[PDB]
Amino acid sequence: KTVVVTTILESPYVMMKKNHEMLEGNERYEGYCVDLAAEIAKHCGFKYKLTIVGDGKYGARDADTKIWNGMVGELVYGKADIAIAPLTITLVREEVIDFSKPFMSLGISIMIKKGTPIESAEDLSKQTEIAYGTLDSGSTKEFFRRSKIAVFDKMWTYMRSAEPSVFVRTTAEGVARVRKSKGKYAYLLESTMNEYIEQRKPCDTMKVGGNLDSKGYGIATPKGSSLGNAVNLAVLKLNEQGLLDKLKNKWWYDKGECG
Amino acid sequence: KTVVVTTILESPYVMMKKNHEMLEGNERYEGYCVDLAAEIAKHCGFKYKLTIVGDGKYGARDADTKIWNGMVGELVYGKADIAIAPLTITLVREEVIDFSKPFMSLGISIMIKKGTPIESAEDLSKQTEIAYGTLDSGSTKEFFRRSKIAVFDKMWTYMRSAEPSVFVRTTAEGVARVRKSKGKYAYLLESTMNEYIEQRKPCDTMKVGGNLDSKGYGIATPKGSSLGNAVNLAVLKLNEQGLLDKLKNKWWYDKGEC
Protein backbone atom coordinates (compact mmCIF):
# COMPACT_ATOMS: atom_id res chain seq x y z
CA LYS A 1 0.00 0.00 0.00
CA THR A 2 0.90 3.64 -0.56
CA VAL A 3 3.07 5.26 2.11
CA VAL A 4 1.79 8.65 3.25
CA VAL A 5 4.67 11.14 3.38
CA THR A 6 4.17 14.37 5.26
CA THR A 7 6.34 17.32 4.29
CA ILE A 8 6.26 21.11 4.22
CA LEU A 9 6.66 23.67 1.45
CA GLU A 10 10.00 25.41 1.99
CA SER A 11 12.56 26.20 -0.72
CA PRO A 12 14.76 24.44 -1.71
CA TYR A 13 13.45 21.33 0.10
CA VAL A 14 9.94 21.13 -1.38
CA MET A 15 8.54 23.54 -3.96
CA MET A 16 5.60 23.44 -6.33
CA LYS A 17 7.03 23.36 -9.84
CA LYS A 18 6.43 26.48 -11.91
CA ASN A 19 4.24 24.47 -14.28
CA HIS A 20 2.59 22.38 -11.56
CA GLU A 21 -0.91 23.00 -12.97
CA MET A 22 -0.03 20.74 -15.92
CA LEU A 23 1.23 17.91 -13.65
CA GLU A 24 -0.25 15.39 -11.20
CA GLY A 25 0.55 13.80 -7.89
CA ASN A 26 4.09 13.76 -6.65
CA GLU A 27 5.32 15.14 -9.97
CA ARG A 28 3.89 18.56 -9.04
CA TYR A 29 6.74 19.03 -6.56
CA GLU A 30 10.49 19.46 -6.82
CA GLY A 31 13.38 20.03 -4.46
CA TYR A 32 15.99 18.39 -2.26
CA CYS A 33 13.48 16.53 -0.09
CA VAL A 34 11.42 15.52 -3.12
CA ASP A 35 14.54 13.94 -4.61
CA LEU A 36 15.43 12.41 -1.24
CA ALA A 37 11.97 10.89 -0.85
CA ALA A 38 12.24 9.27 -4.28
CA GLU A 39 15.63 7.77 -3.41
CA ILE A 40 14.46 6.48 -0.02
CA ALA A 41 11.35 4.93 -1.56
CA LYS A 42 13.37 3.27 -4.30
CA HIS A 43 15.85 1.77 -1.84
CA CYS A 44 13.09 0.63 0.52
CA GLY A 45 10.76 -0.59 -2.23
CA PHE A 46 7.57 1.38 -1.50
CA LYS A 47 5.27 3.69 -3.39
CA TYR A 48 4.27 6.90 -1.70
CA LYS A 49 2.16 10.03 -1.81
CA LEU A 50 3.64 13.44 -0.93
CA THR A 51 1.21 15.39 1.29
CA ILE A 52 1.70 18.83 2.76
CA VAL A 53 1.26 19.13 6.52
CA GLY A 54 -2.06 20.76 7.25
CA ASP A 55 -1.00 23.24 9.91
CA GLY A 56 2.29 24.31 8.32
CA LYS A 57 4.30 23.41 11.41
CA TYR A 58 7.35 21.27 12.07
CA GLY A 59 6.45 19.74 15.42
CA ALA A 60 6.07 21.01 18.94
CA ARG A 61 3.98 20.05 21.94
CA ASP A 62 1.55 22.69 23.19
CA ALA A 63 2.32 23.38 26.84
CA ASP A 64 -1.39 23.61 27.76
CA THR A 65 -3.13 20.94 25.67
CA LYS A 66 -0.01 18.73 25.36
CA ILE A 67 -0.99 18.04 21.73
CA TRP A 68 1.79 17.68 19.15
CA ASN A 69 1.41 19.89 16.10
CA GLY A 70 3.04 19.80 12.70
CA MET A 71 4.64 16.88 10.93
CA VAL A 72 5.57 15.33 14.27
CA GLY A 73 1.91 15.37 15.27
CA GLU A 74 0.90 13.70 12.01
CA LEU A 75 3.23 10.82 12.91
CA VAL A 76 2.38 10.73 16.64
CA TYR A 77 -1.37 10.52 16.01
CA GLY A 78 -1.15 8.07 13.12
CA LYS A 79 -2.09 10.31 10.20
CA ALA A 80 1.12 9.88 8.18
CA ASP A 81 3.69 7.12 7.81
CA ILE A 82 6.89 9.13 7.35
CA ALA A 83 8.04 12.74 7.44
CA ILE A 84 10.67 13.77 4.87
CA ALA A 85 11.50 17.41 5.51
CA PRO A 86 14.05 19.76 7.14
CA LEU A 87 13.02 18.38 10.54
CA THR A 88 15.67 18.71 13.24
CA ILE A 89 16.48 15.75 15.47
CA THR A 90 15.80 17.04 18.98
CA LEU A 91 15.43 15.37 22.36
CA VAL A 92 11.74 16.09 22.82
CA ARG A 93 10.90 14.86 19.31
CA GLU A 94 13.10 11.77 19.67
CA GLU A 95 11.07 10.85 22.77
CA VAL A 96 7.88 10.53 20.69
CA ILE A 97 8.90 9.53 17.11
CA ASP A 98 11.73 7.55 15.54
CA PHE A 99 14.43 9.31 13.54
CA SER A 100 16.95 8.12 11.01
CA LYS A 101 20.53 9.10 11.43
CA PRO A 102 20.88 12.63 10.04
CA PHE A 103 20.77 13.20 6.31
CA MET A 104 22.01 16.80 6.59
CA SER A 105 24.06 18.71 9.15
CA LEU A 106 23.39 22.28 10.19
CA GLY A 107 23.83 24.86 12.90
CA ILE A 108 22.63 28.32 13.82
CA SER A 109 24.64 30.83 11.83
CA ILE A 110 25.04 34.54 11.12
CA MET A 111 23.82 36.11 7.88
CA ILE A 112 25.33 39.52 7.11
CA LYS A 113 25.22 41.91 4.24
CA LYS A 114 28.57 41.67 2.47
CA GLY A 115 30.94 44.26 3.91
CA THR A 116 29.60 44.11 7.47
CA PRO A 117 32.50 44.01 10.03
CA ILE A 118 31.31 40.93 11.93
CA GLU A 119 33.20 37.62 12.03
CA SER A 120 31.62 35.69 14.92
CA ALA A 121 28.82 35.52 17.45
CA GLU A 122 31.26 36.87 20.01
CA ASP A 123 31.71 39.94 17.77
CA LEU A 124 27.94 40.51 17.63
CA SER A 125 27.52 40.05 21.36
CA LYS A 126 30.03 42.79 22.19
CA GLN A 127 28.27 45.58 20.26
CA THR A 128 24.91 47.12 19.35
CA GLU A 129 25.60 49.34 16.30
CA ILE A 130 24.85 46.31 14.11
CA ALA A 131 21.48 45.04 15.33
CA TYR A 132 20.82 41.33 15.20
CA GLY A 133 17.88 39.02 15.66
CA THR A 134 15.99 35.87 14.75
CA LEU A 135 12.60 34.65 13.62
CA ASP A 136 9.96 35.56 16.19
CA SER A 137 8.99 31.88 16.58
CA GLY A 138 10.65 28.51 16.37
CA SER A 139 13.88 26.83 17.19
CA THR A 140 16.50 29.56 16.69
CA LYS A 141 14.69 31.96 19.03
CA GLU A 142 14.22 29.12 21.53
CA PHE A 143 17.94 28.28 21.33
CA PHE A 144 18.84 31.74 22.60
CA ARG A 145 16.03 31.86 25.16
CA ARG A 146 17.14 28.58 26.73
CA SER A 147 20.93 28.83 26.38
CA LYS A 148 23.05 28.76 29.53
CA ILE A 149 26.19 29.62 27.52
CA ALA A 150 27.38 33.09 28.50
CA VAL A 151 27.76 34.57 24.99
CA PHE A 152 24.36 33.33 23.83
CA ASP A 153 22.64 34.39 27.08
CA LYS A 154 24.11 37.87 26.51
CA MET A 155 22.79 37.83 22.95
CA TRP A 156 19.34 36.81 24.17
CA THR A 157 19.21 39.58 26.76
CA TYR A 158 20.22 42.02 24.04
CA MET A 159 17.63 40.69 21.57
CA ARG A 160 14.77 40.77 24.04
CA SER A 161 15.48 44.39 25.01
CA ALA A 162 16.63 45.89 21.69
CA GLU A 163 14.57 48.57 19.96
CA PRO A 164 13.21 48.59 17.37
CA SER A 165 12.38 44.92 17.53
CA VAL A 166 15.11 42.74 16.09
CA PHE A 167 12.70 39.85 15.46
CA VAL A 168 11.07 39.11 12.09
CA ARG A 169 7.97 37.12 11.20
CA THR A 170 9.38 35.19 8.22
CA THR A 171 12.65 34.14 6.61
CA ALA A 172 11.92 36.48 3.70
CA GLU A 173 11.50 39.41 6.10
CA GLY A 174 14.81 38.64 7.80
CA VAL A 175 16.66 38.41 4.49
CA ALA A 176 15.04 41.60 3.20
CA ARG A 177 15.99 43.36 6.42
CA VAL A 178 19.64 42.33 6.05
CA ARG A 179 19.61 43.50 2.44
CA LYS A 180 18.02 46.90 3.12
CA SER A 181 19.82 47.82 6.34
CA LYS A 182 23.20 48.97 4.88
CA GLY A 183 25.12 46.56 7.07
CA LYS A 184 23.32 47.44 10.31
CA TYR A 185 21.27 44.23 10.66
CA ALA A 186 22.47 40.65 10.97
CA TYR A 187 20.09 37.71 10.87
CA LEU A 188 20.54 34.49 12.87
CA LEU A 189 19.22 31.40 11.09
CA GLU A 190 19.96 27.80 10.13
CA SER A 191 23.26 27.50 8.24
CA THR A 192 21.53 25.51 5.46
CA MET A 193 19.17 28.40 4.74
CA ASN A 194 22.01 30.92 5.09
CA GLU A 195 24.00 28.99 2.44
CA TYR A 196 20.93 28.85 0.19
CA ILE A 197 20.31 32.59 0.35
CA GLU A 198 24.03 33.26 -0.26
CA GLN A 199 23.34 31.67 -3.68
CA ARG A 200 20.32 33.89 -4.44
CA LYS A 201 20.48 37.10 -6.48
CA PRO A 202 21.58 39.83 -5.96
CA CYS A 203 24.37 38.00 -4.13
CA ASP A 204 24.66 40.64 -1.38
CA THR A 205 24.47 38.36 1.69
CA MET A 206 26.93 35.88 3.14
CA LYS A 207 27.34 33.42 5.98
CA VAL A 208 30.04 34.52 8.41
CA GLY A 209 31.85 32.84 11.25
CA GLY A 210 31.46 29.41 12.67
CA ASN A 211 28.11 28.02 13.55
CA LEU A 212 26.78 28.56 17.07
CA ASP A 213 25.55 24.97 17.51
CA SER A 214 25.42 21.69 15.60
CA LYS A 215 22.47 19.43 14.88
CA GLY A 216 20.97 17.38 12.07
CA TYR A 217 17.83 16.82 10.03
CA GLY A 218 16.45 13.30 10.15
CA ILE A 219 13.71 11.30 8.49
CA ALA A 220 10.96 10.60 11.00
CA THR A 221 8.58 7.67 11.43
CA PRO A 222 6.06 6.75 14.12
CA LYS A 223 7.74 5.17 17.11
CA GLY A 224 8.23 1.46 16.55
CA SER A 225 7.24 1.58 12.86
CA SER A 226 8.69 -1.27 10.83
CA LEU A 227 9.61 1.24 8.12
CA GLY A 228 12.17 2.92 10.36
CA ASN A 229 14.96 0.36 10.01
CA ALA A 230 14.94 0.28 6.21
CA VAL A 231 14.70 4.06 6.01
CA ASN A 232 17.70 4.51 8.32
CA LEU A 233 19.82 2.05 6.33
CA ALA A 234 18.82 3.89 3.16
CA VAL A 235 19.98 7.24 4.59
CA LEU A 236 23.33 5.71 5.54
CA LYS A 237 23.68 4.11 2.09
CA LEU A 238 22.77 7.31 0.24
CA ASN A 239 25.33 9.20 2.33
CA GLU A 240 28.08 6.69 1.69
CA GLN A 241 27.35 6.61 -2.05
CA GLY A 242 27.74 10.38 -2.21
CA LEU A 243 24.11 10.92 -3.18
CA LEU A 244 23.24 13.23 -0.29
CA ASP A 245 26.21 15.42 -1.19
CA LYS A 246 25.11 15.36 -4.84
CA LEU A 247 21.59 16.48 -3.91
CA LYS A 248 22.86 19.34 -1.75
CA ASN A 249 25.15 20.49 -4.54
CA LYS A 250 22.27 20.24 -7.03
CA TRP A 251 19.81 22.41 -5.13
CA TRP A 252 22.25 24.87 -3.51
CA TYR A 253 25.04 25.35 -6.04
CA ASP A 254 24.24 23.92 -9.48
CA LYS A 255 20.96 25.83 -9.28
CA GLY A 256 22.61 28.72 -7.44
CA GLU A 257 22.85 32.19 -8.89
CA CYS A 258 26.04 33.55 -7.26
CA GLY A 259 28.82 31.32 -8.62
CA LYS B 1 25.38 -4.57 37.22
CA THR B 2 28.32 -2.37 36.27
CA VAL B 3 28.18 -1.48 32.58
CA VAL B 4 31.27 -2.61 30.66
CA VAL B 5 32.45 0.17 28.34
CA THR B 6 34.82 -0.66 25.52
CA THR B 7 36.98 2.14 24.16
CA ILE B 8 40.34 2.65 22.47
CA LEU B 9 43.43 4.55 23.59
CA GLU B 10 43.42 7.49 21.17
CA SER B 11 44.31 11.00 22.23
CA PRO B 12 42.43 13.21 22.98
CA TYR B 13 39.45 10.87 23.35
CA VAL B 14 40.96 8.42 25.86
CA MET B 15 44.46 8.68 27.35
CA MET B 16 46.15 7.23 30.41
CA LYS B 17 46.85 10.17 32.72
CA LYS B 18 50.49 11.12 33.20
CA ASN B 19 50.32 9.85 36.78
CA HIS B 20 48.04 6.89 36.08
CA GLU B 21 50.16 4.57 38.25
CA MET B 22 48.94 6.61 41.26
CA LEU B 23 45.28 6.15 40.29
CA GLU B 24 42.83 3.29 39.90
CA GLY B 25 39.78 2.33 37.93
CA ASN B 26 38.18 4.84 35.63
CA GLU B 27 40.21 7.66 37.17
CA ARG B 28 43.33 6.34 35.40
CA TYR B 29 41.98 7.78 32.16
CA GLU B 30 41.24 11.22 30.75
CA GLY B 31 39.89 12.64 27.53
CA TYR B 32 36.80 13.64 25.59
CA CYS B 33 35.27 10.14 25.69
CA VAL B 34 36.13 9.74 29.38
CA ASP B 35 34.21 12.95 30.09
CA LEU B 36 31.40 11.87 27.77
CA ALA B 37 31.09 8.45 29.43
CA ALA B 38 30.79 10.13 32.82
CA GLU B 39 28.05 12.43 31.54
CA ILE B 40 26.11 9.64 29.81
CA ALA B 41 26.30 7.42 32.90
CA LYS B 42 25.10 10.25 35.14
CA HIS B 43 22.11 10.96 32.90
CA CYS B 44 21.19 7.28 32.46
CA GLY B 45 21.91 6.33 36.09
CA PHE B 46 24.40 3.48 35.71
CA LYS B 47 27.81 2.60 37.09
CA TYR B 48 30.45 1.66 34.54
CA LYS B 49 33.96 0.32 33.97
CA LEU B 50 36.19 1.66 31.22
CA THR B 51 37.99 -1.16 29.39
CA ILE B 52 40.34 -0.97 26.42
CA VAL B 53 39.44 -2.99 23.32
CA GLY B 54 41.46 -6.16 23.41
CA ASP B 55 42.60 -6.26 19.78
CA GLY B 56 43.19 -2.52 19.35
CA LYS B 57 40.85 -2.22 16.36
CA TYR B 58 37.80 -0.16 15.52
CA GLY B 59 35.94 -2.94 13.77
CA ALA B 60 35.43 -4.71 10.48
CA ARG B 61 34.09 -8.02 9.25
CA ASP B 62 36.46 -10.62 7.81
CA ALA B 63 35.27 -11.42 4.29
CA ASP B 64 36.00 -15.15 4.65
CA THR B 65 35.05 -15.94 8.28
CA LYS B 66 32.44 -13.14 8.55
CA ILE B 67 33.74 -12.51 12.11
CA TRP B 68 33.74 -8.95 13.43
CA ASN B 69 36.79 -7.59 15.23
CA GLY B 70 37.52 -4.45 17.21
CA MET B 71 35.04 -2.61 19.36
CA VAL B 72 32.26 -3.70 17.01
CA GLY B 73 33.13 -7.33 17.65
CA GLU B 74 33.23 -6.78 21.40
CA LEU B 75 29.61 -5.58 21.20
CA VAL B 76 28.46 -8.24 18.71
CA TYR B 77 29.90 -11.16 20.70
CA GLY B 78 28.96 -10.08 24.23
CA LYS B 79 32.27 -8.81 25.62
CA ALA B 80 31.09 -5.24 26.26
CA ASP B 81 27.81 -3.44 26.92
CA ILE B 82 28.59 -0.13 25.19
CA ALA B 83 31.33 1.44 23.09
CA ILE B 84 32.22 5.07 23.83
CA ALA B 85 34.91 5.96 21.33
CA PRO B 86 35.58 7.70 18.01
CA LEU B 87 33.65 4.91 16.32
CA THR B 88 32.25 5.91 12.95
CA ILE B 89 28.61 5.24 12.14
CA THR B 90 28.54 3.22 8.90
CA LEU B 91 25.96 1.16 7.05
CA VAL B 92 27.68 -2.19 7.54
CA ARG B 93 28.16 -1.55 11.27
CA GLU B 94 24.58 -0.31 11.69
CA GLU B 95 23.35 -3.67 10.42
CA VAL B 96 24.95 -5.49 13.38
CA ILE B 97 25.03 -2.99 16.32
CA ASP B 98 22.92 -0.06 17.50
CA PHE B 99 24.19 3.52 17.33
CA SER B 100 23.13 6.73 19.00
CA LYS B 101 22.73 9.75 16.85
CA PRO B 102 26.17 11.23 16.25
CA PHE B 103 27.98 13.09 19.01
CA MET B 104 30.76 14.50 16.78
CA SER B 105 31.16 15.05 13.02
CA LEU B 106 34.11 14.09 10.85
CA GLY B 107 35.12 13.28 7.31
CA ILE B 108 37.88 11.37 5.58
CA SER B 109 40.86 13.62 4.91
CA ILE B 110 44.45 13.52 3.66
CA MET B 111 47.53 13.87 5.87
CA ILE B 112 50.85 14.75 4.23
CA LYS B 113 54.34 15.57 5.42
CA LYS B 114 54.91 19.28 4.89
CA GLY B 115 55.99 19.97 1.31
CA THR B 116 54.40 16.94 -0.31
CA PRO B 117 53.01 18.08 -3.73
CA ILE B 118 49.45 16.86 -3.15
CA GLU B 119 46.42 19.10 -2.71
CA SER B 120 43.43 16.77 -3.19
CA ALA B 121 42.23 13.19 -3.49
CA GLU B 122 42.12 13.66 -7.26
CA ASP B 123 45.82 14.61 -7.12
CA LEU B 124 46.63 11.38 -5.27
CA SER B 125 44.54 9.26 -7.62
CA LYS B 126 46.42 10.43 -10.72
CA GLN B 127 49.90 9.38 -9.56
CA THR B 128 51.90 6.66 -7.78
CA GLU B 129 55.22 8.24 -6.72
CA ILE B 130 53.58 9.34 -3.46
CA ALA B 131 52.09 6.19 -2.00
CA TYR B 132 48.90 6.45 -0.01
CA GLY B 133 46.80 4.22 2.16
CA THR B 134 44.74 3.86 5.28
CA LEU B 135 44.00 1.90 8.46
CA ASP B 136 43.18 -1.82 8.55
CA SER B 137 39.80 -2.77 10.03
CA GLY B 138 38.50 0.78 10.02
CA SER B 139 35.72 2.68 8.32
CA THR B 140 37.98 4.56 5.88
CA LYS B 141 39.25 1.35 4.26
CA GLU B 142 35.68 0.03 4.04
CA PHE B 143 34.57 3.31 2.43
CA PHE B 144 37.17 3.00 -0.31
CA ARG B 145 36.61 -0.75 -0.84
CA ARG B 146 32.89 -0.21 -1.37
CA SER B 147 32.99 3.09 -3.22
CA LYS B 148 31.74 3.47 -6.79
CA ILE B 149 32.64 7.17 -6.90
CA ALA B 150 35.16 7.31 -9.76
CA VAL B 151 38.09 8.96 -7.96
CA PHE B 152 37.68 6.81 -4.85
CA ASP B 153 37.20 3.59 -6.82
CA LYS B 154 40.45 4.35 -8.64
CA MET B 155 42.16 5.04 -5.32
CA TRP B 156 40.98 1.67 -3.98
CA THR B 157 42.24 -0.18 -7.05
CA TYR B 158 45.58 1.56 -6.52
CA MET B 159 45.70 0.73 -2.80
CA ARG B 160 44.89 -2.95 -3.34
CA SER B 161 47.67 -3.32 -5.92
CA ALA B 162 50.34 -1.02 -4.44
CA GLU B 163 53.65 -2.49 -3.27
CA PRO B 164 54.81 -2.50 -0.57
CA SER B 165 51.53 -2.54 1.34
CA VAL B 166 50.08 0.91 1.87
CA PHE B 167 47.92 -0.20 4.80
CA VAL B 168 48.72 0.39 8.46
CA ARG B 169 47.63 -1.47 11.58
CA THR B 170 47.08 1.53 13.88
CA THR B 171 46.46 5.23 13.45
CA ALA B 172 49.80 5.92 15.16
CA GLU B 173 51.54 3.78 12.53
CA GLY B 174 49.94 5.86 9.79
CA VAL B 175 51.21 9.15 11.19
CA ALA B 176 54.65 7.66 11.86
CA ARG B 177 54.78 6.46 8.27
CA VAL B 178 53.96 9.93 6.96
CA ARG B 179 56.66 11.41 9.16
CA LYS B 180 59.40 8.97 8.19
CA SER B 181 58.70 8.60 4.46
CA LYS B 182 60.30 11.88 3.23
CA GLY B 183 57.16 13.01 1.46
CA LYS B 184 56.44 9.68 -0.23
CA TYR B 185 53.48 8.50 1.89
CA ALA B 186 50.12 10.19 2.39
CA TYR B 187 47.70 8.85 5.00
CA LEU B 188 43.90 8.79 4.57
CA LEU B 189 42.39 9.34 8.02
CA GLU B 190 39.54 11.15 9.69
CA SER B 191 39.61 14.94 9.94
CA THR B 192 39.39 14.88 13.74
CA MET B 193 42.80 13.21 13.94
CA ASN B 194 44.33 15.11 11.05
CA GLU B 195 43.49 18.47 12.61
CA TYR B 196 44.61 17.42 16.10
CA ILE B 197 48.00 16.15 14.88
CA GLU B 198 48.62 19.20 12.65
CA GLN B 199 48.54 21.47 15.71
CA ARG B 200 51.06 19.52 17.81
CA LYS B 201 54.83 19.04 17.82
CA PRO B 202 56.84 18.18 15.80
CA CYS B 203 54.58 20.27 13.50
CA ASP B 204 55.61 18.38 10.38
CA THR B 205 52.26 17.21 8.98
CA MET B 206 49.30 19.01 7.53
CA LYS B 207 45.79 18.41 6.27
CA VAL B 208 45.23 19.03 2.58
CA GLY B 209 42.06 19.19 0.54
CA GLY B 210 38.48 19.25 1.66
CA ASN B 211 36.99 16.29 3.44
CA LEU B 212 36.11 13.44 1.12
CA ASP B 213 32.86 12.62 2.92
CA SER B 214 30.74 13.68 5.88
CA LYS B 215 29.77 11.35 8.73
CA GLY B 216 29.71 11.05 12.51
CA TYR B 217 30.81 9.12 15.57
CA GLY B 218 28.13 7.38 17.57
CA ILE B 219 27.81 5.61 20.91
CA ALA B 220 27.30 1.93 20.12
CA THR B 221 25.42 -0.83 21.92
CA PRO B 222 24.62 -4.45 21.06
CA LYS B 223 21.67 -4.71 18.70
CA GLY B 224 18.46 -4.55 20.69
CA SER B 225 20.09 -3.59 23.99
CA SER B 226 17.74 -1.75 26.34
CA LEU B 227 20.55 0.69 27.11
CA GLY B 228 20.44 2.18 23.62
CA ASN B 229 17.34 4.34 23.95
CA ALA B 230 18.48 6.07 27.14
CA VAL B 231 22.01 6.62 25.85
CA ASN B 232 20.70 8.20 22.66
CA LEU B 233 18.44 10.56 24.58
CA ALA B 234 21.43 11.49 26.77
CA VAL B 235 23.50 12.31 23.66
CA LEU B 236 20.74 14.59 22.35
CA LYS B 237 20.35 16.29 25.74
CA LEU B 238 24.11 16.85 26.07
CA ASN B 239 24.14 18.26 22.54
CA GLU B 240 21.29 20.69 23.30
CA GLN B 241 23.01 21.81 26.52
CA GLY B 242 26.15 22.67 24.56
CA LEU B 243 28.17 20.14 26.55
CA LEU B 244 29.46 18.30 23.49
CA ASP B 245 30.69 21.61 22.05
CA LYS B 246 32.37 22.40 25.36
CA LEU B 247 34.17 19.06 25.41
CA LYS B 248 35.33 19.47 21.81
CA ASN B 249 36.69 22.96 22.36
CA LYS B 250 38.49 21.79 25.50
CA TRP B 251 40.16 18.72 24.09
CA TRP B 252 41.05 20.21 20.66
CA TYR B 253 42.16 23.53 22.14
CA ASP B 254 45.13 24.87 20.17
CA LYS B 255 47.93 25.73 22.63
CA GLY B 256 49.84 27.27 19.72
CA GLU B 257 52.80 24.91 19.66
CA CYS B 258 52.74 24.96 15.84
Ligand SMILES: NCc1cccc(Cn2nnc(-c3onc(O)c3C[C@H](N)C(=O)O)n2)c1
Ligand atom coordinates in the same frame (compact mmCIF):
# COMPACT_ATOMS: atom_id res chain seq x y z
N1 LIG C 1 45.20 10.04 18.65
C1 LIG C 1 44.98 10.58 17.31
C2 LIG C 1 43.50 10.71 16.99
C3 LIG C 1 42.91 11.99 17.09
C4 LIG C 1 41.54 12.16 16.78
C5 LIG C 1 40.77 11.05 16.38
C6 LIG C 1 41.33 9.77 16.29
C7 LIG C 1 40.40 8.64 15.85
N2 LIG C 1 40.49 8.45 14.42
N3 LIG C 1 40.88 9.46 13.60
N4 LIG C 1 40.88 8.99 12.39
C8 LIG C 1 40.47 7.70 12.56
C9 LIG C 1 40.32 6.81 11.46
O1 LIG C 1 40.90 7.11 10.25
N5 LIG C 1 40.58 6.03 9.34
C10 LIG C 1 39.85 5.23 10.11
O2 LIG C 1 39.31 4.08 9.70
C11 LIG C 1 39.66 5.64 11.41
C12 LIG C 1 38.87 4.81 12.40
C13 LIG C 1 37.35 5.08 12.34
N6 LIG C 1 36.95 6.11 13.32
C14 LIG C 1 36.51 3.83 12.61
O3 LIG C 1 35.52 3.93 13.36
O4 LIG C 1 36.84 2.80 12.01
N7 LIG C 1 40.19 7.30 13.79
C15 LIG C 1 42.70 9.60 16.59
Ligand SMILES: [Li+]
Ligand atom coordinates in the same frame (compact mmCIF):
# COMPACT_ATOMS: atom_id res chain seq x y z
LI1 LIG D 1 12.65 8.67 18.86
Ligand SMILES: [Li+]
Ligand atom coordinates in the same frame (compact mmCIF):
# COMPACT_ATOMS: atom_id res chain seq x y z
LI1 LIG E 1 26.03 20.10 18.44
